[model samples]
Target: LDIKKTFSNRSDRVKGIDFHPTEPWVLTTLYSGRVEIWNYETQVEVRSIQVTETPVRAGKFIARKNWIIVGSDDFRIRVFNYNTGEKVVDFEAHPDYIRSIAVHPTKPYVLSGSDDLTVKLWNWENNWALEQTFEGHEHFVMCVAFNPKDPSTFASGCLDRTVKVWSLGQSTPNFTLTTGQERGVNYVDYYPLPDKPYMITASDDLTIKIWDYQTKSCVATLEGHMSNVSFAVFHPTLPIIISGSEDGTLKIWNSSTYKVEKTLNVGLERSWCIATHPTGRKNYIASGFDNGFTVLSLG
Candidate 1:
């Protein structure tokens, strides 16, 4: 593991972070409503996207478009043309705060989870129309993810203590995974491809749970974070997972053996979000925190 580069993008807490699909760059969203794009290779800030005076919960770059979508507490998803530095579209995505936003790997649409206990799918290319809304969680939906391999199916984790898997054609979830833990779920991600067909989730229980949705069973529970586990994402090309927590540490876990591979202490009180690079050549990762964001090249 190696610490390649680190920088501060905000004086306030960083709410989210994501790496570009095909570039060596990262976008960091702040509670201060500022989103800064930084080049990891050069270790320099490239540009900034300005938003209203509301907390920006999450943001991600569209894989096939010049636009980037950002979620905020204002019940809107702001789509910015990163090339021109203008907010071209504002999608009225949810009733309450938009907690998380995810772009489809092979589609023109995007998915967002909100505090209103809803997951909404919107078509950005054609009129930004609402494709469908999924309602199943009792409390706030904390995070949503698109299946990289099976785009028809996606996952949502909620404060209602369940991780629900939904098909694009269904209004209700097909299966709900909950171990009866009252701590509530914080984040979830689908395993990349035709391998194990598993989903990983981070929870307020300070644990990461791996589930086999086909059988509705939790195959493994990883305990390491001392505080709430905020985020977990699978490496794009490796059988590894990266997780961040309120405990201020980012852990690299071997997904195959379900063991902690390495621990990164960023000297943060809370690591809010962790993103894996789309290309795994250098094993790069970005962790957003109270102090700033760190780009690490881990082996």
Candidate 2:
């Protein structure tokens, strides 16, 4: 039997969710311009805030802190104090819709990707100014992530079917890994390991490419999904990847061999995002779908 819970009341679809590093809550952003805080265990609403101007695409909590950050269609990034439910700062980072926002694993810096074809770095502690703007993508930049081991290094994937890695000391990307896909890329994430950095990308071409970051080359292509792969994530401690697809299935793949280990169909066809628990739980993977969200667990 599958035990599950749902947080329902999103006027539009929920686009993103980030669990607080230490708290028992998860922050979510909806297409209706609402950001909600929910108690993870009870599935009850803790708080909800609205941004008047635009729909929110992504929201995340700073690791182990009371601060949460959101990126919206208004081309602005907003930081809030989750404890007090107060807005801290709002600043325009792009000329078009912001697709994703990532907080540094240990630092006060934030990175954002936008439809303006740029990735921007902000100094969160110093009034959220545009500290650095990275321009290379020919199309919309979809997702960005910071390396947990080295917060100064980050990576972004764009609609142009390329992923670029940026370091703090360099003006341009240290290297770019091309996906070689005919369609656009949507999301990309770095492997959590320090010594060996690998990246996984989801694309509209119905495949996921795993890249060896050190070599700046594609190491593997996972191509079993019938529909577009929306998001891909690595297991916290194992060499496994979980991918959510628009085909309504969640798949587990072995990172070393790039083979599908298992597939679970949750009956929802329009899957959008997949996330593993930050606490290193192995059995459960949280996924966002067309209707709402669901927790997939082993029998």
Query: Top model by lDDT, which number?
Result: 1
The TM-score, computed over Cα atoms with residue i paired to residue i, of candidate 1 is 0.95
Residues 144-249, candidate 2: write the lDDT tens digits. 9887777788888899988888997577888788888768889998888776678889998998988888777788899899998889988776678989888888
TM-score of each: 0.95, 0.91
Residue pairs clashing in model 1 are: none
The models' CA-based lDDT, in order, is 0.83, 0.78
Candidate 2 global CA lDDT score: 0.78
How well is each residue in 1-299 modelled by candidate 1, as lDDT tens digits?
55565444545778888888777688888888888889877778878866868888899988568777898887788888887788878867787998888888777878899888998888876788998999878999999987777878888999999988899979778888875557898898888778688888898888898888788788888998899899887888777889999888988889889999988786867899878877775777788899878877775
- Stretches of model 1 off by over 4 angstroms after superposition: 6-10
